[PDB]
RNA sequence: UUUUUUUUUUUUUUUUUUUUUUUUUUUUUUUUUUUUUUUUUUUUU
């Protein structure tokens, strides 16, 4: 019931839009989550994840 | 012609000092040369 696969949704902008302001798809409430993801996708060969915090 | 210690004397003989000391230790503290507001590719459409 959040919309976050929705088309043109307020979503995206839940901060900016100040509709929240502790965003839970933040990386930072995600740490672990955020770690293990990088961690995998960089020893796949990613580029991407090669600087991640 | 030599002489053949780049040896030498007079004792001597720690580039040893004793006065007590002896972490180029002080800490009252307090100890990520961390810090919070989200955030967290020196990512872009």
């Not at 502790?22 to 990386?27: A, D, G, Q, V, W």
């Amino acid at each position: 019931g959040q919309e976050i696969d929705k088309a043109d949704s307020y979503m995206p902008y839940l901060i900016d839009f100040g509709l929240s302001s502790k965003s839970p798809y933040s990386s930072v409430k995600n740490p672990a989550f955020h770690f293990w993801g990088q961690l995998t996708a960089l020893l796949l060969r990613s580029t991407r994840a090669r600087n991640a915090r």
